[PDB]
């Protein structure tokens, strides 16, 4: 009997443990189950992650493995496959989130056989035992990348089932797939990484790598990324892999701190006067408050899916202090419009933007719309293809007084 490999935010046979730990004891067989708890969201994501469904695919195939893809819900579709299959186990990457501790419950209930889960890569566990708010003390733990996992070189043949449905996403998608994810990596590294700490917080965020949307589903491995990186070293590869840990700070927060999906960290802001405007609230939503800016921001996003992180940390904080719009209306929405959603980094990140209490960042620190723009965008290119509307950075009839809306939060904050 085959060994069922479970792939879930993982979508990539190189440096997967799950996969390796199951060949080596025998056959196996790969699946994949479209869970309506994950596959029920805008239609840009659905497809970005069906795509790469359907590259795993292909990758299984080239190597003249099988790949299943079921339709359903896990509890009901692995133990189906696995029947089917007469899989003697089923391997998978343990997942600490709310829903996939539940899911991975209930499969465990409804499997007649072992489900072994084994811990996924990362560069610093999100289980630790100590819990750290800030990012400083956390980072020091991290003394380099381990080695990542090979691939196969060749997969044993096995019987493939299920049909991987066709989405339209309503935009034009980054090239799917591992391949494509290796590629970006490598060019990234051999161009950009160099001067990565110069270049990183350009408004165009093209100082980066925009592997993002890959590393959101697992397509590229952190623990690979990280390691190549450091091959390389330098300033460069010291500030990237830097912010590869902020990605696994803000699943340790996420752990540590569940309670912050639903309230602030900082419990001295667990009663802001969220003013909740349904007409402020379109106007940033669709980036017609009037700063060139948050407008360009929010223009991007809607028309590609991606935003660089300097733009991401205005847009949200212009929201939240500028306009008092409450951050869980606007994450959500925000969450859905990129390709690289992930639910504990986009609360991180708004939390943080936002002055809600990550990396205790101080509530009076407030950007300039303006400024920022003028000192993070040369001849306002980035602007000029977003906002050409805008003839600069100046606010040209924003739908509240910057000046005053600024007082009006600082006003507010100390308190
Ligand atoms: C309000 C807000 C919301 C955000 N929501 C998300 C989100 O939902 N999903 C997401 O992937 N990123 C989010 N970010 C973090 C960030 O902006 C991106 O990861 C980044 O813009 C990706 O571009 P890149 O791939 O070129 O990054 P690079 O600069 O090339 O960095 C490489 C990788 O490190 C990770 N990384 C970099 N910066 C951060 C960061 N600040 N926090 C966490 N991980 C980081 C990403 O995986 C990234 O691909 C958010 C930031 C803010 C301020
Ligand atoms: C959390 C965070 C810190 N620093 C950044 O530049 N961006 C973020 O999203």
New binding site residues.
């Given amino acids: 009997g085959p060994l069922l490999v479970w792939h879930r935010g993982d979508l990539r046979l190189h440096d997967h443990p799950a996969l390796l730990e199951a060949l080596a004891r025998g056959p196996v067989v790969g699946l994949v189950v479209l869970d309506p708890n994950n596959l029920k969201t805008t239609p840009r994501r659905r497809a970005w992650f069906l795509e790469n469904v359907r590259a795993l695919r292909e990758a299984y195939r080239a190597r003249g493995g099988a790949l299943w893809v079921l339709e359903g819900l896990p509890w009901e579709k692995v133990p189906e496959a696995a029947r089917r299959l007469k899989a003697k186990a089923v391997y998978a990457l343990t997942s600490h989130t709310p829903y996939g501790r539940y899911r991975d419950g209930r499969v465990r209930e409804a499997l007649p056989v072992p489900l072994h889960l084994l811990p996924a890569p990362h560069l610093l566990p999100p289980d630790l035992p100590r819990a750290y708010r800030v990012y400083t003390p956390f980072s020091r733990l991290y003394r380099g990348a381990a080695p990542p996992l090979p691939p196969p070189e060749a997969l044993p043949k096995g019987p493939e089932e299920g049909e991987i449905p066709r989405e339209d996403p309503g935009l034009p998608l980054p090239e799917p797939g591992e391949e494509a994810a290796l590629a970006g990596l490598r060019a ?1 590294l051999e161009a950009k990484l160099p001067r ?1 700490a110069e270049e ?1 917080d350009r408004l165009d ?1 093209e ?10 589903l697992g397509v590229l491995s ?1 623990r690979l ?1 990280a390691w190549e990186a450091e091959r390389r070293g330098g300033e460069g590869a010291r500030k ?1 892999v830097a ?2 840990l ?2 696994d ?2 699943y340790h927060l996420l752990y540590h701190f569940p309670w912050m999906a639903e309230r602030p960290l900082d419990p001295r802001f667990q009663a802001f006067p969220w003013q909740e405007d349904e007409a402020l609230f379109q106007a940033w939503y669709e980036g017609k408050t009037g700063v060139p800016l948050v407008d360009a921001a929010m223009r991007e996003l809607h028309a590609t899916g ?4 300097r733009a ?2 205005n ?2 904080q212009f929201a939240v202090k500028h306009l008092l719009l409450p951050w869980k209306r606007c ?1 959500e929405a ?2 859905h419009l ?1 390709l ?4 504990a ?2 609360l ?3 939390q ?3 002055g809600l209490g990550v990396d205790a960042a101080p509530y009076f620190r407030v950007f300039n719309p303006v400024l920022q723009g003028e000192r993070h965008d040369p001849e306002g290119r980035w602007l000029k293809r977003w906002a050409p509307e805008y003839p600069s950075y100046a606010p040209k009839d924003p739908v509240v007084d910057l000046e005053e809306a600024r007082r009006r939060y600082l006003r507010l904050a100390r308190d």
């Avoid at 100082?207 to 959101?216: Q, W």
């Avoid at 690289?340 to 639910?343: A, F």
């Fill in positions: 990234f990565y990183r965020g100082g980066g790598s925009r592997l993002s949307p890959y590393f959101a952190p990324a990237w912010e590869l902020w990605r700070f803000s991606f935003l660089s992180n991401r940390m847009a949200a994450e925000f969450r990129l690289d959603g992930d639910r980094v986009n991180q990140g708004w943080w933007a936002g």
